[PDB]
Each structure stands twice: as structure tokens, then as C-alpha cells.
Structure 1
Amino acid sequence: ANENNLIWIDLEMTGLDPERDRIIEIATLVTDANLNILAEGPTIAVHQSDEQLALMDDWNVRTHTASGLVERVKASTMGDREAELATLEFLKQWVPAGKSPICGNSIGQDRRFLFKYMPELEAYFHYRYLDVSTLKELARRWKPEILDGFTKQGQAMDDIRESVAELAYYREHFIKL
């Protein structure tokens, strides 16, 4: 455990509305304060009912079926609470409660789903947000030149590792240390 470590997280959901939609995937990963990847946490397909999956709009059915996530959700024996507790069992080994901001890309949406469906995991984070896309937005406005230099190869944890590498790029090319 170290109080400067960062919790990175990436959810998949059935849609964008926490009131109607559910979490169907959680992945976590911990870095040190300098973005050295310490440990990859468990990628868990979160079981939801056939009823709930049938409410998915066409974009979500297409994406989550093609990826194999829909199959893994149907087969999963872990609901919201089991996935929450397994994620906490992983994070407790690496980061104390209330210290890491929520880190990732478009993490405001993810935190909304944590508040509704995994409030204990939500509480484990510092109140603050580290959305890498905050730096992409500023870069696009103040220094667009640097955006040509970074590329994504287009898997939850591939997205997290890409988010870490993206923050590291902004640390070298956008920040002044």
C-alpha cells in the first residue's frame, strides 16, 4: 500500500443512463504517482438479466455482442455486489481508501454508475477526478500540434493501459516539470 498510487478504472454499461442501464464490465489497474503500472486488477463481466440486456439500443447490442461481452455477462455468476467486493479486494492491496482520484478516460460517466450500483467502491476513491481527456481537451485548444504524435490501436484493459500511456505523453509534451 502507498498513498500516492493511482486507481485507473474502465466500466462497460448497457447504455448511458444509470437510472435504466447497468454495469456489465469492470476493469481496474494501479500505477504509482509517476504512471509506472504496479498491477492489473481483475476484468469482470458483471451478470445482468436477459430482460436488462434486451433493453440495450442497437449500438450497445452490436458492440457488446461482437466483443464477446454479452456471452460473458450471461455466463457470469458475479452481480454488481460481487464485482464491487472483488475489485475492492484487489485495490486494498495497493492503495489506501480516500487517496486516489478516479483515473481513466471519460470517467465522469463511470463514477455515475459507481454511485448508483457500487457505492462502496465509489467511496474508496478520493472525491476528485483525473480524466486524461481533460488534458486532451486543453491540448486541442492550446497546443493541437502534440495530438498528431499520439495514436491508439483501437478490450477494457488495453483501453486503460492506452489511457495511462496518453497521460504519460501529456506529461512529456504538454506539462512543464
Structure 2
Amino acid sequence: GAMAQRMVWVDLEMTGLDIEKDQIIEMACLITDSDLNILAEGPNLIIKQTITLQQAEYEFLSFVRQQTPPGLCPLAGNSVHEDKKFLDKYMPQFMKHLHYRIIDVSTVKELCRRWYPEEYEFAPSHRALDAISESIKELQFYRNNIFK
């Protein structure tokens, strides 16, 4: 039903894209329903190299366990495939609660750019939680402007 169709939105800041050497500096999480209405805001945590990585994972896993059913909801965000790679490595217990699929807003952007170039031209951060809010607005924009 509607519960399985929720989305687990995240935004992460890393030192870089090298999975073997770079680390997660910042992370935020929030839950939307299938229509992108924000149901609950999770924490915005700055991770050490403020809190430790293992405690941030407990904070985020507790937050999604009380908002989504296990293994059903996908990770959502801007270029969230980059975020998933670091979360599979550094937060594997948090990832055990989610589906393997993602709702990558930048995939939608790559399709908008190609198929609706006029709409792409007029398509619309101090915290990672603010970046999530911006990515939801970008996705809502594609829903209204390029989807049927």
C-alpha cells in the first residue's frame, strides 16, 4: 500500500568520491510519502574524522525503523547512487532497512535535459537537510513539467 511507497531521502557530504579513502563528513535524512509530502524530518549530523559514524548510524536507523517497513522503501536524493556506495560500506545496518533501488533525482534531470530542453532551462546549501528540501523541489518540478 501507501506505507511501502514511502521514500527515505538522504543527503551526504564526503571528503571525495574514492570509496577506499574518503569518509562521510555530514548526513541528513527525512521521510516523504509517495507524493513527496514530508512526513518526518530526521537529524542533520556532522560526523567526526557533532558525533561518531557508528552513533550517527544508530540515530538514522532508529529514525527510519519508526517511519518505514523493513526492506521496502528506497533511498532518494540528488545523485544518491554516490551516497548509496558510501552508506553500503559505512552504514550497512542502516542500508539493511531499505530496498536496493534508488530514486535518483539526477537520473530524472538527465532525461529532462534530453527530452524537455525548454523545461530544463527554467528548472529550479548550508546544511545537508536543506539540500534534501532542494532535491524534493527539483523532483516535484519534473513531476509537474515533464511527466504526463
Q: So what's the TM-score if we normalise by structure 1?
A: 0.78
Q: 2:81 aligns with which of 77, 94, 108?
A: 108
Higher helix share: 1
Q: Which amino acid aligns with 1:25?
A: E
Give 1:22's aligned residue: 23
1:164-175 matched pairs, under 5 angstroms: 164-175=136-147
Distance, in Å, in 1 between the alignment partners of 2:73 and 2:135 is 16
**Is residue 83 from structure 1 mapped to residue 84 from structure 2 by the alignment?**
no
Partner SS, residue 43 of structure 2: coil
1:28-107 matched pairs, under 5 angstroms: 28-48=29-49, 76=50, 78-107=51-80
RMSD: 1.6
Distance, in Å, in 1 between the alignment partners of 2:118 and 2:96 is 38
Give 1:7's aligned residue: 8
**Is residue 126 from structure 1 mapped to residue 109 from structure 2 by the alignment?**
no
Distance, in Å, in 2 between the alignment partners of 1:79 and 1:99 is 27
Distance, in Å, in 2 between the alignment partners of 1:105 and 1:93 is 24
Give 1:136's aligned residue: 109
Q: Which amino acid aligns with 2:142?
A: Y
Higher strand share: 2
Q: Which amino acid aligns with 2:103?
A: L
Q: Which has the larger radius of gyration?
A: 1
Q: Which amino acid aligns with 2:53?
A: D
**Identical-pair percentage:** 48
Structure 1: 4+ residue segments shifted above 3 A? none
Q: Deviations over 1:80-106 (max 9, x none)?
A: 111001001111121112111110001
Deviation of 1:149 (Å)? 2.5
Q: Flag structure 2 segments of 5+ consecutive residues without an equivalent.
A: none
Q: Which amino acid aligns with 2:96?
A: A
Q: Flag structure 1 segments of 5+ consecutive residues without an equivalent.
A: 49-75
Deviation of 1:119 (Å)? 0.7
Partner SS, residue 94 of structure 2: helix
Q: Deviations over 1:100-155 (max 9, x none)?
A: 1110001111111111111111222111111011111011011111112222x892
